[PDB]
């Protein structure tokens, strides 16, 4: 490998070869179906709302999330990057598609497959992901680093359905060596929301921008169609002219079919027909590729960029609403403008690669921290892009100040912005792109008066229960099937209606929203009041035996939402203390002094109780009427977790809150597989893991995250360390189960999940609070 040195890969890049097998994969841990698209994943390349797009570490273009809401993995093979080489002085040349793989079928059979073994490397730091190449075959190597521009306090570049590829280009070797670099893409138009005639009208184009010292040459793959649909739209990719560097290209090859009248003209020499076309297609699918070809001698190093757009502005969900996508705001609506996304991006990549530097650089040169935890941090913010995002610009037929956001808790339980999670999952909305955060929080507000008295039927016992009800905080604000944003709750396995949890995380959302971004947001603050107000007033209502703290009842009315709760929960009742305490300090800054004084009374009540109830002498129980009251539960503080981070003090003793979390660390983490896979949720005193529901014998990782940064909070240093490198040694380690990229919500003792791609594990940044 002497092409690393050319470029600048982090040491704390995740790192796997290509073409490399994993053997210790994680498998899904229940019964019913559930997605399970294998260990070949990268990071993702598409902005927020954009839609976007999994290229893996084996270079193929797999996990399609253009569909917003839904996760289709499968390689589209025209969809790749191929590299043709000839030293001076001999005979033949050789080509090689960049792809550690082959198609199923005899379609692109001519084309140059199975990229060897040990041949490379694929590196990921997002929102970057590198690829290298030190090929025995290949005496020129080559590296690329692709991105897409996202950036933390920008809301327009983040933005963006387009995608970097800065190819650099080095000869160690003593001959000239002939050198092309080819971009080949399928015309997807019809790929997803198209019943018939699935590429009929296809057609595409080739566009030369000869601006002065800007020349750039690119494919726009679409469709005759002028129609305004989720389906329509176009795809580009292209090429900036560099010194010492020619252009070729082909407009239109056929990838249902065999692919050589693209390949017998670059394993030639390396140089395309430069054959415009635009005769659209009918049955057959299309593509074009975009090539660059140059000479280096000995020595030599040439940089290339290349990049990817794709412009379909619409997404429906499947209650039939049709929205524009966020970028709309920036290029437009009518789903001609892949080009001019293409050209932003290959006329300004390298200002938005110092753009993302500026902001990993505080972390990245901080070097009392791990590199493993580096790692983690960046790379699990992929979900914010992957997790489904929906960021709207209008609804079709529709102007509004505001464009709602929505990410999905995961894609098994299809729901926007589960509040219970995001509870966890939202610290990087809140860090880094806070007006995103109070934007959602806005959107929880507006819904706390809601009422829909239709009924639906509770998964979990079959009962049938209100779908809504007025002064209750929703569990989601809808599915991607359905009509997100418009049909709230779309969670039936519990009734949320009745949750212990969700009004106290709403009022602790808003309180640390308010903290987080500097104490200055009043009229954020002023928005959300009567809605945090209600929020309590309601909740104190389930307070079935003038404790002060609302009963749970029995059954699983929160987050742990097959693990039933009854009486006084550590949980829930923990988290009451610190709302209460979030909405006092709200009363006293807005000068609501009746509000003040009434949630302080409650308080000091709710406390004492609390302390009386459940405080043992070295843990907070469970809860007062459970089988396993005395279980240790990881989560037994949240309440107080979240007290830390909005600076309300103690809502308990110190030196308690100092026991319990040694206790959890002694316990939950240390007894539990050596404490190298997280925290399990519950613990019997005996040290043995509570088996009264499966969800106690789960390690939840954006619960474990969540107790790490409680844990460095207070001092406990080793221990938070400790505890959060278990989630990563099992999503990122070779000796893991193989999840990067795709972080489930739980994993029990032999390391197999539930629910893959989950939104909770973003709390990872809690810990940079
Ligand atoms: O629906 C989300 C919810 O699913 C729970 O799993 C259920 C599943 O929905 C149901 O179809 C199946 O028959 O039973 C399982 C429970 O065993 C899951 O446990 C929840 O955590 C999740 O929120
Ligand atoms: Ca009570």
């Given at each position: 490998d002497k092409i690393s040195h050319k470029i600048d890969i982090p040491d704390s890049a995740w790192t796997i070869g290509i073409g490399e097998k994993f053997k210790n994969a994680g498998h899904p841990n229940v019964k019913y179906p559930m997605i399970d698209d294998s260990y070949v994943q990268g990071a993702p390349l598409g902005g927020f709302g954009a839609g976007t797009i999994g290229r893996t570490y084996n270079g193929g273009?797999?996990?399609?999330?253009?569909?917003?809401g839904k996760n289709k993995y499968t390689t589209?093979?025209?969809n790749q990057f191929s590299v043709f080489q000839k030293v001076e002085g001999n005979k033949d040349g050789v080509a090689q598609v960049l792809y550690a793989g082959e198609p199923?079928?005899?379609?692109?059979?001519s084309w140059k497959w199975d990229?060897?073994?040990?041949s490379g490397m694929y590196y990921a730091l997002y929102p970057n992901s590198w690829y290298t190449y030190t090929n025995k075959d290949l005496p020129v190597q080559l590296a690329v680093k692709q991105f897409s521009?996202?950036?933390?306090?920008?809301?327009k570049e983040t933005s963006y359905p387009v995608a970097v590829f800065k190819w650099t280009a080095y000869n160690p070797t003593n001959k000239n060596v002939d050198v092309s670099i080819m971009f080949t893409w399928q015309?997807?138009?019809?790929?997803?929301?198209?019943?018939?005639?699935?590429?009929?009208?296809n057609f595409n184009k080739i566009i030369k921008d000869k601006s002065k010292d800007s020349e750039i040459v690119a494919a726009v793959m679409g469709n005759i169609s002028n129609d305004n649909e989720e389906w329509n739209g176009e795809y580009s990719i292209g090429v900036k002219k560099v010194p010492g560097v020619d252009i070729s290209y082909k407009a239109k090859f056929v990838?249902?079919?065999?692919?050589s009248d693209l390949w017998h003209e670059f394993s030639?020499?390396?140089?395309?027909?430069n054959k415009d076309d635009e005769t659209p297609t009918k049955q057959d699918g299309i593509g074009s590729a975009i090539a660059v070809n140059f000479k280096l001698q000995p020595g030599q190093t040439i940089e290339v960029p290349f990049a990817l757009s794709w412009d379909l502005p619409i997404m429906k969900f499947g209650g039939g609403d049709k929205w524009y996508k966020m970028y709309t705001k920036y290029?437009?609506?009518?789903?001609?403008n892949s080009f001019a996304i293409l050209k932003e991006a290959l006329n300004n990549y390298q200002k938005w690669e110092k753009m993302i530097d500026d902001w990993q650089k505080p972390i990245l040169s901080n070097?009392?921290?791990?590199d493993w935890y580096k790692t983690a941090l960046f790379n699990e913010l992929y979900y914010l892009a992957d997790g489904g995002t929906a960021w709207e610009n209008?609804?079709?037929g529709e102007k509004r100040t505001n464009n709602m956001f929505g990410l999905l808790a995961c894609f098994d339980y299809?729901?926007?912005?589960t509040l219970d999670v995001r509870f966890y999952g939202s610290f990087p909305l809140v860090m880094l792109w806070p007006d995103i955060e109070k934007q959602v929080m806005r959107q929880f507000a507006d819904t706390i008066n809601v009422q829909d008295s239709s009924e639906f039927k509770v998964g979990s016992n079959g009962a049938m229960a209100v779908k809504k009800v007025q002064g209750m905080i929703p569990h989601?604000?809808?599915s991607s099937y359905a009509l997100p944003?418009?049909?709230?709750?779309?969670?039936?396995?519990?009734?949320?209606?009745?949750?212990?949890?969700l009004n106290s995380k709403y009022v602790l959302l808003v309180y640390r929203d308010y903290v987080l971004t500097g104490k200055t947001d009043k009229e954020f603050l002023k928005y959300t009041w009567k809605s945090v107000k209600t929020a309590l007033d309601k909740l104190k209502e389930?307070?079935?035996?003038?404790?002060?703290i609302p009963d749970?009842?029995?059954?699983?009315?929160?987050?742990?939402?097959?693990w039933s709760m009854k009486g006084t929960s550590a949980y829930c009742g923990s988290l009451w203390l610190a709302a209460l305490k979030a909405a006092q300090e709200i009363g006293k800054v807005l000068k609501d002094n009746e509000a003040y004084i009434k949630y302080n009374e409650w308080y000091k009540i709710a406390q004492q109780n609390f302390e009386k109830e459940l405080?043992?002498?070295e843990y907070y129980n469970?809860?007062?009427?459970?089988?396993?009251?005395?279980s240790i539960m990881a989560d037994q503080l949240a309440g107080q977790w979240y007290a830390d981070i909005l600076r309300?003090?103690?809502?308990?003793?110190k030196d308690h809150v100092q026991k319990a979390l040694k206790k959890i660390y002694e316990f939950?983490?240390?007894k539990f597989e050596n404490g190298?896979?997280?925290?399990?949720?519950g613990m019997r005193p005996d040290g043995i893991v509570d088996e009264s529901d499966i969800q106690a014998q789960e390690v939840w990782t954006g619960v474990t995250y969540a107790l790490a940064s409680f844990m460095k909070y207070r001092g406990m240093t080793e221990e938070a360390y400790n505890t959060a490198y278990g989630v990563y040694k099992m999503t990122?380690?070779?000796?893991?189960?193989?999840?990067?990229?795709?972080?489930?919500?739980a994993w029990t003792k032999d390391g197999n999940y539930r629910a893959s791609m989950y939104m909770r594990p973003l709390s990872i940044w809690s810990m940079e609070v």
């Open positions: 273009f797999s996990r399609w999330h253009l569909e917003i589209v093979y025209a199923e079928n005899g379609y692109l059979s990229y060897p073994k040990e521009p996202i950036i933390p306090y920008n809301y015309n997807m138009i019809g790929f997803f929301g198209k019943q018939v005639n699935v590429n009929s009208g990838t249902t079919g065999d692919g030639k020499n390396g140089i395309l027909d290029f437009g609506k009518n789903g001609k070097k009392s921290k791990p209008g609804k079709v299809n729901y926007y912005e989601d604000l809808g944003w418009i049909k709230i709750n779309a969670y039936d396995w519990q009734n949320p209606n009745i949750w212990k949890d389930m307070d079935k035996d003038n404790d002060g749970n009842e029995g059954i699983p009315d929160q987050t742990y939402d097959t405080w043992n002498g469970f809860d007062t009427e459970s089988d396993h009251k005395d309300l003090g103690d809502i308990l003793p939950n983490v240390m190298k896979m997280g925290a399990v949720n990122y380690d070779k000796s893991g189960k193989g999840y990067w990229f795709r972080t489930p919500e």
